Design a protein around this nucleic acid. Sequence first.
RNA 1: GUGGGAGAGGGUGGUGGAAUUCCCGGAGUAGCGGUGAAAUGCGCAGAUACCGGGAGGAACGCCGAUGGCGAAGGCAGCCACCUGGUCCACCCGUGACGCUGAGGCGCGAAAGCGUGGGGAGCAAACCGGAUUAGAUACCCGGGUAGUCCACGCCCUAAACGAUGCGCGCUAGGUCUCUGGGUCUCCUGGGGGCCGAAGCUAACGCGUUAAGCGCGCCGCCUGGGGAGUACGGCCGCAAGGC
Lengths: 101, 88, 119, 73
Amino acid sequence: MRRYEVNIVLNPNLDQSQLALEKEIIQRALENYGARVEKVEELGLRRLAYPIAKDPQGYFLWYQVEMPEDRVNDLARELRIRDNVRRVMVVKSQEPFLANA
Amino acid sequence: PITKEEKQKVIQEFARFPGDTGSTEVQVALLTLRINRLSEHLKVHKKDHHSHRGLLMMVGQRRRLLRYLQREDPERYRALIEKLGIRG
Amino acid sequence: KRQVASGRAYIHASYNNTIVTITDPDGNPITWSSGGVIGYKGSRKGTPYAAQLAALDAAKKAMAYGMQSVDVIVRGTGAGREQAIRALQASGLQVKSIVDDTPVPHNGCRPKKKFRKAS
Amino acid sequence: PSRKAKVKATLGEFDLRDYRNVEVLKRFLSETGKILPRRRTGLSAKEQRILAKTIKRARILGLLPFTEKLVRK
RNA sequence: GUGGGAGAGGGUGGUGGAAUUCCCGGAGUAGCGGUGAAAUGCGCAGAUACCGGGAGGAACGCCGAUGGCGAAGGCAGCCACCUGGUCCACCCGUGACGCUGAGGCGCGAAAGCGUGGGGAGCAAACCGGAUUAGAUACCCGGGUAGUCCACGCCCUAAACGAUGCGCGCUAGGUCUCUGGGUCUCCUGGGGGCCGAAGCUAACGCGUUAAGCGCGCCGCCUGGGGAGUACGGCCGCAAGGC
Ligand SMILES: [K+]
Ligand SMILES: [K+]
Ligand SMILES: [K+]
Ligand SMILES: [K+]
Ligand SMILES: [K+]
Ligand SMILES: [Mg+2]
Ligand SMILES: [Mg+2]
Ligand SMILES: [Mg+2]
Ligand SMILES: [Mg+2]
Ligand SMILES: [Mg+2]
Ligand SMILES: [Mg+2]
Ligand SMILES: [Mg+2]
Ligand SMILES: [Mg+2]
Ligand SMILES: [Mg+2]
Ligand SMILES: [Mg+2]
Ligand SMILES: [Mg+2]
Ligand SMILES: [Mg+2]
Ligand SMILES: [Mg+2]
Ligand SMILES: [Mg+2]
Ligand SMILES: [Mg+2]
Ligand SMILES: [Mg+2]
Ligand SMILES: [Mg+2]
Ligand SMILES: [Mg+2]
Ligand SMILES: [Mg+2]
Ligand SMILES: [Mg+2]
Ligand SMILES: [Mg+2]
Ligand SMILES: [Mg+2]
Ligand SMILES: [Mg+2]
Ligand SMILES: [Mg+2]
Ligand SMILES: [Mg+2]
Ligand SMILES: [Mg+2]
Ligand SMILES: [Mg+2]
Ligand SMILES: [Mg+2]
Ligand SMILES: [Mg+2]
Ligand SMILES: [Mg+2]
Ligand SMILES: [Mg+2]
Ligand SMILES: [Mg+2]
Ligand SMILES: [Mg+2]
Ligand SMILES: [Mg+2]
Ligand SMILES: [Mg+2]
Ligand SMILES: [Mg+2]
Ligand SMILES: [Mg+2]
Ligand SMILES: [Mg+2]
Ligand SMILES: [Mg+2]
Ligand SMILES: [Mg+2]
Ligand SMILES: [Mg+2]
Ligand SMILES: [Mg+2]
Ligand SMILES: [Mg+2]
Ligand SMILES: [Mg+2]
């Protein structure tokens, strides 16, 4: 049971119904792997620095979670199956390192 | 890994007395726990040699501590071997 | 016969030859030139003067399509790159910007023995 | 000698391990998408070593570029 | 033991972009390429240069360093999991449990061997072009094994700090990595430079000793013959000890 952070970049061209279905599948897969959610930050569509999937923008999602480590990798694969989901990055949570303090 | 609760479990299990954290029995028990964990790690990932060296070092240390216990008090030596199930 | 009136200019400058390709803003070429298009045949193509001739010839070929303003793009470290730059800079064509887009790899492929002692 | 300005001194309080904050990490990239050296950032060894991995994370996420094109050459 | 720390330490899976090659399309014309100069080569079956899309393999630019990690070989995109080593603070526990180490056992860059796979770039052999008095070379155009992966062999090296391991003692200055602290600085571990005493044939070494000591292992006894012969052991072979 460690604390992780999930970054999900998906298609910015989705309407509200398809986006709701994508997020429903995300929540369902998180429940299926026992990932308690501590907080969420939905930043919406943003301008990428380079085109991803031939699209110059991307819709961002961020989830600070806590889950068993042994299936973390096994969870990430499940999130990459959806064609609308084009970027998935899971990172172990770390305390912030402040500079110029 | 090896969380602190399991470490305290084995320490309080093999403690000669409350407060003892460094007697020979405790050290050999901790080395045995780490050795079994590393052997289970090395059944898979059998191409990992840098950790196999650490396994060799831990085995040597446990053998030397058991030899010291054999020399000083063979009764606690037999008791430790019987409780842990070592030497085959 | 397209009457482009505005496009891009790619300059591929190498130690053996300098070659200019004048394209439209979408990248599709219109005309082009090089040291071999001019009478120069051998090593004289990797010359700054040959690069100037190639740039001016491509520019005059682009004048036939009635083009005025260009966007210059430089690729490759070769003799005569800046000379072709200065040739296109004052050639009747208006140079709007100069951009170096030399393709540098991230240590992907092993170079030839000529370019070894690196990666 | 890079006497123009130091990026750390030209900035305030910020998190070095935050890979999502773009408007701060953009200041640490050069005119190209390259990571600035120590002489430009004015950071220390540990700070630079953390900044490298965080910038790479932001690059993989698509927030920071891998490389850019030089202008006005 | 407790609490913390840094790291390209190792193994497994996944994943990212730049570039090379190839394919598809668009656009487009007479050469590209290459060299001291050239020619082979490729190009009217439309190349080179340009734009877009796709496939595949291999290596990870900036960060990056005089840096870090490992016992050595060696380790460099990113993420996750498994895992080794190590350092510091507290002075908590055991109570000499220590050092070295003939054999044994394991690891061991590259090249090479076996089976299967993969094969973009590079490239022994080889096919050519040049150069040359000749050119079985350097230079140029191609190109197979190989480089890559899995499993199993092979045990070599300028395997180098040409300096075995451990401990104690013996001026400092400066740079740096990484902890701790009363954080001008002090203290501890690691990487550099200059240097006290001292050592050395000299060069140079000098708290990271090649100084002063102690313990243990390895090895040397003129050069060629020769790391050859014989014998043995190991190896599928090449061959190694
Ligand atoms: K010809
Ligand atoms: K080094
Ligand atoms: K083959
Ligand atoms: K030797
Ligand atoms: K400090
Ligand atoms: Mg997908
Ligand atoms: Mg030429
Ligand atoms: Mg690592
Ligand atoms: Mg075509
Ligand atoms: Mg060719
Ligand atoms: Mg060819
Ligand atoms: Mg022909
Ligand atoms: Mg024809
Ligand atoms: Mg091509
Ligand atoms: Mg393309
Ligand atoms: Mg293929
Ligand atoms: Mg570098
Ligand atoms: Mg070290
Ligand atoms: Mg080395
Ligand atoms: Mg005490
Ligand atoms: Mg006592
Ligand atoms: Mg030893
Ligand atoms: Mg031995
Ligand atoms: Mg080997
Ligand atoms: Mg090999
Ligand atoms: Mg093979
Ligand atoms: Mg094969
Ligand atoms: Mg080749
Ligand atoms: Mg060749
Ligand atoms: Mg030849
Ligand atoms: Mg001669
Ligand atoms: Mg002749
Ligand atoms: Mg073969
Ligand atoms: Mg050396
Ligand atoms: Mg040595
Ligand atoms: Mg030494
Ligand atoms: Mg020191
Ligand atoms: Mg000195
Ligand atoms: Mg003296
Ligand atoms: Mg002297
Ligand atoms: Mg010493
Ligand atoms: Mg003799
Ligand atoms: Mg000899
Ligand atoms: Mg002899
Ligand atoms: Mg030999
Ligand atoms: Mg024999
Ligand atoms: Mg035999
Ligand atoms: Mg032979
Ligand atoms: Mg021999």
